[PDB]
Structures are given as C-alpha cells and as structure tokens.
Amino acid sequence: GPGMAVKHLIVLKFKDEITEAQKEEFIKTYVNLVNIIPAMKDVYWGKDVTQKNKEEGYTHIVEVTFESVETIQDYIIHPAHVGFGDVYRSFWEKLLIFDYTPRK
Amino acid sequence: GPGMAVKHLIVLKFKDEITEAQKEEFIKTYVNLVNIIPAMKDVYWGKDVTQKNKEEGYTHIVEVTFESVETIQDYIIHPAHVGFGDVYRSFWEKLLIFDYTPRK
Numbered sequence: 481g482p483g484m485a486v487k488h489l490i491v492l493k494f495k496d497e498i499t500e501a502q503k504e505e506f507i508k509t510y511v512n513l514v515n516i517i518p519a520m521k522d523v524y525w526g527k528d529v530t531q532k533n534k535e536e537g538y539t540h541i542v543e544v545t546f547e548s549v550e551t552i553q554d555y556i557i558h559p560a561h562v563g564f565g566d567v568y569r570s571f572w573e574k575l576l577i578f579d580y581t582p583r584k
Numbered sequence: 585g586p587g588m589a590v591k592h593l594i595v596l597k598f599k600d601e602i603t604e605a606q607k608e609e610f611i612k613t614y615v616n617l618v619n620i621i622p623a624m625k626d627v628y629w630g631k632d633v634t635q636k637n638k639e640e641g642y643t644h645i646v647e648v649t650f651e652s653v654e655t656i657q658d659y660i661i662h663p664a665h666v667g668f669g670d671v672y673r674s675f676w677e678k679l680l681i682f683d684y685t686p687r688k
C-alpha cells in the first residue's frame with residue numbers, strides 16, 4: 481500500500497536481578513496494552529540471540545506500528561501506558577526508543 | 585507461516601562531522617549489498633524523529649531480513665561486508681547489532 485505509517489521501536493536491557501520469568505510477565509502485560517490503548521495497532525517482540533554489543537547488552541526488542549508520531553504520543557500519555565511505565569520502571573537498566581517510517 | 589526468518593537490526597549514530605551527503609552515500613551503498621550478498625532478502629531503514637535517547641544519541645535504524653542465523657553468518661564474513669566496513673567504519677560513532685525472530 482501507499483500508506484505512510486510510523487514504527488515505534490523499543491530496545492530494552494533489564495536489570496541483572498530480573499528473572500527470566502519476570503521478563504516474560506513484563507512482556508505479557510505490555511502486549512496486553514493493545515486491547516486497551518486505541519493507538520496501538522500491532523506488537524511484535526523478540527529476544528536477541530547473538531549478544532554482540534559488549535557493555536551495551538540490550539536483550540529485548542519490541543516493535544509497534546502506529547498511524548503517526550502524534551498517535552505514538554497518544555500511547556505515551558494513555559493512562560494504561562503511564563501506569564505500566566510507572567510500576568515497571570525499576571525493571572530496566574537501559575531503554576532506547578525510536579520512531580521512524582521505514583523506507584528502501 | 586511456511587517461511588522462517590530472522591531480523592538483523594542495526595542501530596547507528598554517525599560521527600558529528602559526517603555530512604548528510606556522506607550519510608546518503610553510506611546508506612545507498614549498504615542497501616545495494618542486496619545485489620551482492622544474496623542472503624539479504626529485504627533491507628528497510630529509517631531515521632528517528634523523536635530524539636528521546638538522552639543518554640546515547642542513536643539516530644538511524646536498519647533492518648535486514650534473513651532466512652536463518654546461518655545465512656546471517658554468511659553475510660557477516662562475506663568479503664563485500666568486510667569491505668563495507670573497510671570503507672565506512674570511520675563514519676559511525678556508535679553501533680548496536682541485534683538478531684532476533686519477531687513473535688507475538
């Protein structure tokens with residue numbers, strides 16, 4: 481299609497004390513936001529397998545499609561997102577966010 | 585689906601003195617590798633528009649689709665990939681590399 485949607489990419493390193501089961505619950509309760517936040521179109525996630533980044537050991541990648549930067553911003557301030565971020569902020573050591581329109 | 589795939593994700597910050605013309609050369613030559621390295625099935629890239637990574641400053645995202653981690657390895661050691669580094673390594677200040685299978 482000719483559409484011009486925008487991807488929201490999250491790259492995450494959890495604190496060392498967070499267990500694998502806790503990471504799984506974190507991801508599960510994040511994906512559930514799709515059922516609550518209108519702007520959230522779809523979610524994919526993955527765990528890195530090559531561990532190539534040395535001291536910057538991010539492990540988890542989450543990708544969400546949105547209709548525009550403005551609706552990404554709607555998602556950021558939605559109370560279910562604010563509430564998730566508040567209570568799970570101590571889970572992560574490093575967080576990177578990117579909003580972009582993929583191109584050839 | 586019937587096809588398996590792994591995503592190869594590159595996150596990049598250029599050095600401050602690199603020009604927009606240089607970034608365009610870099611990116612065009614990278615995306616052209618699909619004509620040299622058959623393992624590369626798709627390449628999409630984009631530039632972050634939000635700029636909210638206060639601690640790091642990454643700007644560019646490149647996503648390459650591969651069939652498997654084995655064909656990613658073929659790409660890494662391919663002479664044209666080594667050669668791309670030979671000519672363009674001096675262009676980036678920071679780099680992150682990830683390999684993952686996206687899932688729901």
Ligand SMILES: CCCCCc1cc(O)cc(O)c1C(=O)O
Nearest residue numbers: 490492510542556561565575577
């Ligand atoms: C699965 C990780 C969710 C991270 C939640 C979050 C926290 C924050 O401080 C800033 C953000 O832009 C986001 C987000 O993009 O959702």
Ligand SMILES: CCCCCc1cc(O)cc(O)c1C(=O)O
Nearest residue numbers: 532594596614646660669679681
């Ligand atoms: C367009 C970004 C160029 C990155 C080239 C590169 C450099 C490096 O030091 C390690 C790598 O795994 C890669 C790569 O995966 O392609």
